[PDB]
Amino acid sequence: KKVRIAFIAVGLRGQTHVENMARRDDVEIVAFADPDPYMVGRAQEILKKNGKKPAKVFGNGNDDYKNMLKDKNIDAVFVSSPWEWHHEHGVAAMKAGKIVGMEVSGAITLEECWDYVKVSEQTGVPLMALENVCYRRDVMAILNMVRKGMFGELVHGTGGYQHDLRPVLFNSGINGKNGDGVEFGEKAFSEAKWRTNHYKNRNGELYPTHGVGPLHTMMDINRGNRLLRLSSFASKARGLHKYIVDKGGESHPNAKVEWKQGDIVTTQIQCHNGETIVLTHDTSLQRPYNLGFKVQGTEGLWEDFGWGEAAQGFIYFEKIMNHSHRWDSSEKWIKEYDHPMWKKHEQKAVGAGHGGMDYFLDNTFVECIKRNEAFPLDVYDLATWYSITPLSEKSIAENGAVQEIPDFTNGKWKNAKNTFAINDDY
Amino acid sequence: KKVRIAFIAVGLRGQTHVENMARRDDVEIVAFADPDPYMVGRAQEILKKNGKKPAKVFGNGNDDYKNMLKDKNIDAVFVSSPWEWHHEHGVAAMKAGKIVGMEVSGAITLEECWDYVKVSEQTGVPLMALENVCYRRDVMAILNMVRKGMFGELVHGTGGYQHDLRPVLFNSGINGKNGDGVEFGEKAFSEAKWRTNHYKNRNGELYPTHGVGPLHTMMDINRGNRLLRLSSFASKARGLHKYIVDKGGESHPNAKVEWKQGDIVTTQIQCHNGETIVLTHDTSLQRPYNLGFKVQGTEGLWEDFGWGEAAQGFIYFEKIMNHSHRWDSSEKWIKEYDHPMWKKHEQKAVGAGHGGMDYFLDNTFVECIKRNEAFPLDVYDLATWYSITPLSEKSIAENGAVQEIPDFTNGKWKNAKNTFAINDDY
Numbered sequence A, B: 001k002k003v004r005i006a007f008i009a010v011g012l013r014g015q016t017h018v019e020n021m022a023r024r025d026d027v028e029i030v031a032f033a034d035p036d037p038y039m040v041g042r043a044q045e046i047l048k049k050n051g052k053k054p055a056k057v058f059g060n061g062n063d064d065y066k067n068m069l070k071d072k073n074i075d076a077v078f079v080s081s082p083w084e085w086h087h088e089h090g091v092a093a094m095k096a097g098k099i100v101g102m103e104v105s106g107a108i109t110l111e112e113c114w115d116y117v118k119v120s121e122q123t124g125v126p127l128m129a130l131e132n133v134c135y136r137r138d139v140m141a142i143l144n145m146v147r148k149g150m151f152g153e154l155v156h157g158t159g160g161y162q163h164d165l166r167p168v169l170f171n172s173g174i175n176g177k178n179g180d181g182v183e184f185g186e187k188a189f190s191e192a193k194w195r196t197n198h199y200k201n202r203n204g205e206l207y208p209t210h211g212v213g214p215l216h217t218m219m220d221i222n223r224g225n226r227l228l229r230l231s232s233f234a235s236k237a238r239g240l241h242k243y244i245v246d247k248g249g250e251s252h253p254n255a256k257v258e259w260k261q262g263d264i265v266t267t268q269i270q271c272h273n274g275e276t277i278v279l280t281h282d283t284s285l286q287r288p289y290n291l292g293f294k295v296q297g298t299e300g301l302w303e304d305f306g307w308g309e310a311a312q313g314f315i316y317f318e319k320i321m322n323h324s325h326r327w328d329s330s331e332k333w334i335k336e337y338d339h340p341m342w343k344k345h346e347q348k349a350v351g352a353g354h355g356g357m358d359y360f361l362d363n364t365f366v367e368c369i370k371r372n373e374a375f376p377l378d379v380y381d382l383a384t385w386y387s388i389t390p391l392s393e394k395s396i397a398e399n400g401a402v403q404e405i406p407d408f409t410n411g412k413w414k415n416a417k418n419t420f421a422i423n424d425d426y
């Protein structure tokens, strides 16, 4: 009756998923696979806090997930591992017959992207792209407004991961602490272990899903529309080196590393039905958090400046606002057009509840498994978004040359229907 | 002692320059060249209003400017003609030995751009790019902050001409009126006569200077830095056709024209010293006016949302704001770092005065002529900005292919010094 879920990687993000599942009565958390004992310990404390019994632990090295996947009891797994581990963990899960919730990132290679889709089609095991910003309360209100016809026909959108990650990319290596040092790699903690290395060896749109995801759902990408091609420009890198010097002096070994990842990487994308999308990757500079959303059509325009609250944006609807030629605050619009799903289940996610947009993402994951239904953000969408990373790197290496984005759906995009948040439950 | 100025084209923008000159005691307005008697009449009324004597009128057809340029008394001319007339009027002026103030736009061809620079170098007659948004009060305050070191090292900027021009591109053809009809071409009035045709036959960044200009001055383009290459993406065109139908029904002949100009055209530009610039052209859709500025460096970030007032933006300075991670209103920063030029001469441009940013632009023009000094925004800058248009069209025709931007300075950019608003007078 209830879904048996396990976790490959219970680091800081894995722990969030553990909490979401631990708060449900329709799920049993069977097992964890993580080589770090400290991370496993906090995950076990989340279970104990929610009155659920401990999980079986597979903590013997990097390959112990293989032994966890042999458990026939497990229905589905969450994959919350480092970027370089996503493909190996995800395809091994589908081959073992486990439904997969895959954390966001970009692909290491374009080949990974195709292999996700091909393994999933052959095994018949579906995968969900765990993009939580698609469930953000303001974004869902805008989706509702778009579908009501309030924006008219969309022509353009922007978004991007613009979040100061300097204190996450560098720390002391002390368990549980960020922003308290200048170390990265083998001796660092959490994301500083693995993420910062990508900034050293690569230059591209390393994290596209948070900005492209919402636009995907609004412009029907892979569901009547698709992404055609892209071009990426990268600025110089200055922010990470400056951070290391300001926090840990010029004497530190890490003040000597030349970072390849430009501070701002912008990406233009053409869509089949004529829309354009501009993404921005911005994680090594001082700034407030703001994903920089813009949704623009023939009858409506929305721009945000915050982290998703009702009043943290501007909106203009010509025909509804008497051709005033002035921005309105987004506030009364986000509240009035709050998505039905949020209006119904608010108190499971906020106030008396917990998780926010993450509650709703993981709720859709579990409800689709219980109902035996296709995910609204599926393996084809994962592959598409993931492919933006390798193709952007090739664009930058070619001084901005245009790269065709593959059609991972093989013509299926033409007739596929948008099923993202089309009801008030999941 | 005083500068003798004449005007090729006294349409709506020419009239503004006429008023600026008519209010000065160090200028004599000698002559007008315009084939439209209605436009000449309002310009003559501006002189009469300011107690200055009438101008000699050259109104016999399109070529009568040639006869005006034979007047040896004329020191300088303002060129405020349609885009397709800029090159012919500008080079004929320099060849006749007249200093030129050239209105903004883009080039019709890349060849025009080179011919401006080559004619100017051969004749020895300088040309000023009349970019007024460079003198906008908030932009000048940000320039001041950048030069004070408050943004640290710049890595990225955005801007764009984002201004709803539907009521300017279509009118009834009645003299003096806009937004009152759906006609364009030979029977329309003012910009509807000529500008709208470009939307029908072309697709690109048709108007780059308002957004790139401010960034030019802040990133030292052509003055220690330069623009290397670009790539342009264009969305579908939907806004102009929809406007025609909503205002004048489907029965109108103009509801039948397929517009080539996409509603949103975005352009990525690489700079020599590592910065990137993204421009946006957005003139055929509903929206409030906002040029969408972003200035981003290692210690500061600014974004605006209005038409240039002090409180119509957000700003973040990590080290000055106690690492708060929250936007501040731009207001107290724009007021505290108001450019010296504005603080000194405020009452000549606003309040008791007139013109705003246009006062300051035309003041720099006249003061450079009186002092026999090089313009801060010169023929090389005109050519550079102008070249963004033809190269964007070629990029769009090549599905976003990267285009090299020529070096119109021939290596002079390396050692040239930024002289834009480096004093409190001009």
Ligand SMILES: NC(=O)c1ccc[n+]([C@@H]2O[C@H](COP(=O)([O-])OP(=O)(O)OC[C@H]3O[C@@H](n4cnc5c(N)ncnc54)[C@H](O)[C@@H]3O)[C@@H](O)[C@H]2O)c1
Pocket: A008, A009, A010, A011, A012, A013, A014, A033, A034, A035, A036, A039, A061, A062, A063, A065, A080, A081, A082, A083, A085, A103, A104, A105, A130, A131, A132, A189, A190, A191, A192, A193
């Ligand atoms: N969508 C979101 O809101 C969101 C938020 C944070 C992180 N993330 C994503 O989640 C993923 C993980 O990020 P994080 O912040 O939790 O990093 P983290 O360093 O805290 O966690 C990674 C965990 O993976 C474990 N691990 C590494 N190799 C393994 C292996 N071979 N087998 C099993 N476990 C292994 C580590 O021991 C660690 O516990 C990344 O892809 C990141 O981008 C998404």
Ligand SMILES: NC(=O)c1ccc[n+]([C@@H]2O[C@H](COP(=O)([O-])OP(=O)(O)OC[C@H]3O[C@@H](n4cnc5c(N)ncnc54)[C@H](O)[C@@H]3O)[C@@H](O)[C@H]2O)c1
Pocket: B008, B009, B010, B011, B012, B013, B014, B033, B034, B035, B036, B039, B061, B062, B063, B065, B080, B081, B082, B083, B085, B103, B104, B105, B130, B131, B132, B189, B190, B191, B192, B193
């Ligand atoms: N920088 C700014 O703030 C700003 C503002 C408005 C317009 N502009 C620019 O100014 C220019 C003109 O725009 P406008 O709004 O004044 O258009 P307009 O139609 O009102 O004026 C154009 C004038 O040029 C005249 N003209 C056409 N051909 C001529 C010729 N061969 N010889 C002499 N005169 C001729 C017309 O009769 C008309 O009076 C354009 O390049 C436009 O982009 C700049």
Ligand SMILES: CC(=O)N[C@@H]1[C@@H](O)[C@@H](O)[C@@H](CO)O[C@@H]1O
Pocket: A132, A133, A163, A165, A168, A210
């Ligand atoms: C929605 C959101 O911004 N998510 C990001 C997540 O993807 C990851 O980058 C993390 C690093 O600490 O910071 C945020 O939580």
Ligand SMILES: CC(=O)N[C@@H]1[C@@H](O)[C@@H](O)[C@@H](CO)O[C@@H]1O
Pocket: B132, B133, B163, B165, B168, B210
């Ligand atoms: C600074 C500013 O936005 N200038 C523009 C100008 O360039 C032109 O496009 C005009 C059309 O009516 O609208 C504005 O005044």
